[PDB]
Each structure stands twice: as C-alpha cells, then as structure tokens.
C-alpha cells in the first residue's frame, strides 16, 4: 500500500534529517560555555539558535514546502520552531536520568539547567512528560522525521495565508505516515500509533503556548534579551 511516491517522501525526509542533525554535537563547542541568576541562558540560547538553523535546513527539504510563498514559509517556521526543537531533542533525551545528553557531561542538560535559563516548572514538567511519552512510543526514524514535517506544515498556524495549500502538503505527509504505520510498524507497537502521534502534536501546541509566555516574560527584561541571539529574537520576538 506504501506507494512509490510515499517511499520517496520518506527517503527525502530521512536524508533531510541526517543532513541537519549532528549526533556528535561537535558544534556545541562554539556556543557560549554552560555555567552551573540565569547562568545557563547564554549557552542554551546559543543551542536554540543553532537548532533553529537546523530546523530551517530540514524544513527546506520537506516535499512541497518550497512551493509556499516566502511569507507562509516564514510563519510556519516561526510558529513551529520551538516545537520541532523539542521534538528533535528527543533524540538526545534519555530516560536513564531524564536529561538531554548531547555527548558529554558539559552538554548534558537536566531540569535544573532548563530552570537556570529562566524557565519554570509550568513548562518543564509537561516538557519532561512529553519527552517520556514520545520516547515510550519508540518511533521508527521514519515516523520521527514524518512527525517533524507534519508539525511544521500545519494549516492552523497563526498568520498562514494559503491554508489550503499548507493543508494539501500536510495531507500528503499524513497519508504517508498513516500508510507507513499500517504497512511497516508491527503490532502491538502500531496500536493507535497515528492517533498517539497526533496527540503529541497537540501536546507540542500547549508547550509552544507556555514557552511563548515564559519567553515573553523573560525577553521583556533587557538584561535577559541582551543574552539572547539575533536569530532567536527575530524568530521568537523582541
């Protein structure tokens, strides 16, 4: 049932993810150093800024994404950026000790590190629960990259002009995901997997909303906004 077109889509997204996710985390050496006051804000702001660039690189390779206007590409990335970053971070998350392990002790981030960047349990608690629930899905990488692509091209994002085209692109990805699970994910792990994955997209919307609140509060203070990056300020707001 998985058409030739649908395997091609999966192959592109798998390649797009491999070209934009460095599992060695080598570039983390270029960030401002972590310090363990919002002592982790400079380092984690650099990390998020680095992640935005990777998310843009991935989005540019989603089939159909380039057929959107520049305005629609921008609003989709602006709205989805923090969700895809949280999604992508699941690859580094470990349930061994509920942390994001990016290759070394310096680049291992726990709830204390996120709190030392300015965020509170109102975000961090549902964030950890999201990372655990996503991990418990044990997605195929095929499912992981499809979920990221579907996240980005959502027609209900604020500011979308051409919602009909956005929905068309997303529908092709969703049908690809549904068919992949049916034909390639064996039971019992396949049980209601598509519904559970869409529920995770709903979770990300709520995490996005709470991150926006805390970011607005954080960035409202110039002492904090000084520690952000230009790209982060452009994407998330001033």
């Amino acid at each position: 049932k998985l058409s030739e077109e649908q395997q091609h889509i999966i192959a592109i997204l798998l390649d797009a993810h491999h070209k934009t996710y460095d599992p060695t985390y080598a570039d983390f050496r270029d960030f401002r150093p972590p310090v363990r006051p919002l002592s982790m804000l400079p380092h984690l702001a650099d990390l998020v800024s680095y992640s935005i660039q990777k998310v843009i690189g991935f989005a540019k390779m989603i089939p159909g994404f380039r057929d959107l206007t520049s305005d629609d590409q921008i609003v989709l990335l602006k709205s989805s950026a923090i969700e895809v970053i949280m999604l992508r971070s699941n690859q580094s998350f470990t349930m061994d000790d509920m942390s994001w392990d990016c290759g070394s002790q310096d680049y291992k981030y726990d709830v204390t590190d996120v709190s030392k960047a300015g965020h509170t349990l109102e975000l961090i608690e549902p964030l950890i629960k999201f990372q655990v629930g996503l991990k418990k899905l044990n997605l195929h990488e095929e499912e992981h990259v499809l979920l990221m692509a579907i996240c980005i091209v959502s027609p209900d994002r604020p500011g979308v002009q051409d919602a009909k085209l956005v929905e068309a692109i997303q529908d092709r990805l969703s049908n690809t995901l549904q068919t992949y699970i049916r034909c390639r994910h064996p039971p019992p792990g396949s049980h209601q997997l598509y519904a559970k994955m869409i529920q995770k997209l709903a979770d990300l919307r709520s995490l996005n909303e709470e991150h926006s609140k805390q970011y607005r509060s954080l960035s409202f203070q110039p002492e904090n906004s000084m520690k952000l990056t230009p790209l982060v300020l452009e994407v998330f707001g001033n």
Binding site: Q53, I56, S70, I74, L77, K78, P230, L231, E234, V235
Partner: peptide, 10 residues
Amino acid sequence: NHPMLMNLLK
C-alpha cells in the same frame, strides 16, 4: 521584517 529567516530560507 525577517532578514535572517529569509536568508536562511534562500
């Protein structure tokens, strides 16, 4: 409005 986003999208 979004020059850095635009340039990365190029």
